Write a protein that binds this ligand. Structure first.
Ligand SMILES: O=C(O)[C@]1(O)C[C@@H](O)[C@@H](O)[C@H](O)C1
Ligand SMILES: O=C(O)[C@]1(O)C[C@@H](O)[C@@H](O)[C@H](O)C1
Lengths: 498, 498
């Protein structure tokens, strides 16, 4: 429906003076409005304090006095709570949020007494699940019937497939709708509002100031996900994985998209079940995916056509949805990214026998000295398929070898986990770690002080990434750009997007 | 497993000095220990601050430094976070909670370096659902394998039936287990820990200081639910309803149980689906239920035997599980409680045609002047079955009549909702409102200033309640006691138990 989504900053400071500073900070960061969470004030003098906030806020104000029975902090008399909201309205609030449960009564109380600019949000919060389209429709209709100006429905993501139902509601409900899905699995619903008709989304002043599960920062909305550029025609891409919150794929692809003015947006896709995910998001809206752990090997099966190199490897890390058919095309950019990063660093030992191990093993047998496979589960077979070893014995194994970790071992937050004893490392000339979060794993740290050559995950990451760009956009990989983007925007540690 | 459950108070103040005061308050209220949520400190000087807390706390200390990726507030370096926890241990902490994800690494780091009193909790938090017993078992086994001293598993209640699986885990896992289910539908799991083997439960300093959804206060655990009296043999009772959070049935029945030293405990039962609920909790552990809206009429069907008065009414508000069979016996205490309350106040108009309306209508035709039925949906038929009217017309209707609301209209938080216009009230001698939360509804308020006689919900509530006691316990209804209990413990307004 109508306008691009607004960005609202929750203001939850426990004193009036700190709230005022928070509204200023909201203006600074680029928020469009603020939600004043009155129920978070430790001491509250309604007449005096409401007046102060409305006077001093540089942004339009939305007031919320959230009761315990709707997930809030306010306990006490219900009429007094409504008095405050009515007061906010007549003191010049731009919005109040009133709970569906008491909305009929409340809107009756201000009938013919509303100021000209004033809008009433009527909200419903579901902390269990995301109901069927049938039930959401009934919920919209009920909220409309209270006399709401704006409908607000927050649900909870049990699975990422849930978000599609919320998109359908914001997309087609003929009433201004704030429709958001909480939880890490609902994060996509907070980002893509401007594509699917959402009236507003909440972005935090910073990560410590979250008012409901899954909210990103205002800064990430604007600068990372390029919120203002997202529109009805924007194509959606994302990294399919579990976990997913460490991935810097959305950082690099969104910068690149923006840099070449490509109408695409890239998000995190926390996916429990690959098959159900691809079925839930089969529309043209969803144009391509990167595939991470644990879905690489799996994605090879869900693809309708598979690139020879990908079939020869047995794993897909990149999925393109063809405009023509609607059919999924699978590629693998892990192989060349791994090999090229290693060669640039200059028999190879490949840790792990998942999708990345497959790609790195395959490419290693192709380009000179060749390969030993090492994995947790010994059966992972791979070593026979390309010409084995278990990591129980990996410490026990030439003195100028190459080691290549392709597992998640060492990945944040498991920063003291290494796949091999430091003592075994001085028998290696070079060691490659696919893990790029953190940049210096325990493996790479210990390998460096073992005299060996270290090639970090980012060397692999950037290479496989600009190849995914090319697949995604059909535009020549802007390699120099992707290096520049990673350096400038991809260098911070301990980031979780969730 | 082993000891009665401990009561732990979450300490979340954002400064060190305020935390110290909170630990003292915890001691005051009766908590057994405190969980120091280090990730909530705005300014933190680990060495100095840890020392202060450990020195000044009157209670055993559990330290938690919860990262963003596990629902906490801490962002930053992972090794620094672990350093703090290790420091807490060596400064004399009684426990630390370390997240399952990094527990192996962490416990390896303190191997042979743990103080004598010190225990390591290893925790897993599930904000989506409550997994199958199969998956919970695997989760227990994984947590055990890290070298945990104590297993902590928090899940989320999608339905109240979920809690039974958590009870099975705490009951039978041969390792100290903290097993809790979050959300209003999981509240029962926090109360009944001492019956089902739980090592610990969290209770708040007050309702504003909740660290995870559904936690009751320490004061309610101890004084309302009689936490210390709950044991493996305690029989469980509860109010089945939706909503349920307003009910004072747990206040009155737990006082009565305690007063006559009956080994029972009464909780809120937020039930979406009656049939599935009764199936999930069919064991002897669950000995009886009160039935509220919307399950009264329904419960009549789920009962194996039905008391004549209940069959004659068509609704069950009390369910007893017979020790003999295991079979459900249904009774109705609404009829006599409604009628007696009205008579004591001294043609009748009955608002509502649910379970309560049925009982009140039936008893009214039996005892003198007789009855007109009024309901939202006009078809609710009732008026023919006992000898009709819709509330659209109820305002339009002798000058010494009796009005009896038996719906939830006017119930908190809908305090300005009344089922009838004030103008129609001066045509009534007496008006009864089954709603006892709040005590003075809009209906009773306006009726009093309309000159009429007012009989409040509590007159009905207490009467039907001591009759449920008699059914539940087989002990003579201590009527004077129930009046005294309601007066002393049941008088506070705007209480939500959730
Ligand atoms: O975003 C990531 O960290 C990736 O997982 C890196 C590497 O695994 C690629 O093959 C995936 O497509 C994306
Ligand atoms: O706890 C309540 O408020 C009740 O709902 C009051 C009345 O409805 C009784 O019949 C129920 O058993 C309990």
């Amino acid at each position: 429906v109508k306008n691009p989504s607004l960005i609202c900053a929750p203001v939850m400071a426990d004193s009036i003076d700190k709230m005022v500073i928070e509204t200023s900070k909201a203006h600074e960061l680029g928020a469009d409005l603020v939600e004043i969470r009155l129920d978070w004030l430790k001491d509250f003098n309604p007449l005096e304090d409401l007046k102060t906030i409305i006077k001093k806020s540089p942004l339009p104000t939305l007031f919320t006095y959230r009761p315990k029975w709707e997930g809030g902090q306010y306990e006490g008399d219900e009429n007094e709570r409504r008095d405050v909201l009515r007061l906010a309205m007549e003191l010049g609030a731009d919005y109040i949020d009133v709970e569906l449960q008491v909305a009929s009564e409340f809107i009756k109380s201000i009938d013919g007494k509303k100021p000209g600019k004033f809008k009433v949000i009527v909200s419903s919060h579901n902390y269990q699940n995301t109901p069927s389209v049938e039930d959401l429709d009934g919920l919209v209709a009920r909220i409309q019937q209270t006399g709401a100006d704006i409908v607000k429905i927050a649900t909870t993501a049990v699975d990422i497939a849930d978000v599609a139902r919320m998109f359908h509601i914001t997309s087609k409900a003929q009433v201004p709708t704030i429709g958001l899905v909480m939880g890490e699995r609902g994060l996509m619903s907070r980002i893509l509002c401007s594509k699917f008709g959402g009236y507003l989304t909440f972005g935090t002043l910073d990560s410590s100031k979250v008012s409901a599960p899954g909210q990103p920062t205002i800064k990430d909305l604007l600068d990372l996900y390029n919120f203002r550029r997202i529109g009805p025609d924007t194509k959606v891409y994302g990294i399919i994985g579990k976990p997913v919150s460490h991935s810097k794929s959305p950082i690099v692809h969104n910068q690149a998209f923006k840099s070449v003015d490509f109408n695409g947006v890239y998000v995190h896709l926390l996916v429990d079940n690959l098959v159900s995910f691809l079925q839930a998001y089969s529309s043209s809206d969803f144009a391509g995916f990167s595939c991470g752990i644990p879905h690489k090997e799996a994605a090879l099966q869900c693809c309708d056509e598979v690139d020879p190199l990908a079939k020869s490897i047995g794993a897909v890390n990149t999925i393109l949805r063809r405009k023509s058919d609607g059919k999924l095309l699978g590629y693998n950019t892990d192989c060349i990214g791994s090999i090229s990063a290693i060669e640039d660093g200059l028999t190879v030992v490949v840790i792990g026998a998942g999708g990345a191990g497959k790609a790195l093993a395959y490419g290693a047998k192709e380009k000179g000295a060749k390969v030993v496979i090492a994995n947790r589960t010994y059966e992972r077979e791979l070593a026979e398929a390309i010409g084995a070893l278990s990591l129980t014995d990996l410490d026990n194994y030439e003195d100028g070898m190459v080691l290549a970790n392709t597992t998640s071992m060492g990945m944040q937050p498991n920063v003291e986990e290494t796949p091999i004893s430091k003592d075994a490392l001085k028998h290696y000339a070079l060691v490659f770690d696919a893990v790029y979060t953190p940049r210096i794993t325990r493996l790479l740290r210990e390998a460096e002080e073992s005299g060996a050559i270290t090639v970090s995950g980012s060397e692999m990451f950037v290479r496989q990434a600009y190849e995914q760009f090319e697949i995604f956009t059909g535009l020549p990989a802007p390699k120099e750009l992707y290096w520049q983007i990673m350096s400038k925007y991809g260098s911070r540690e301990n980031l979780y997007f969730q």
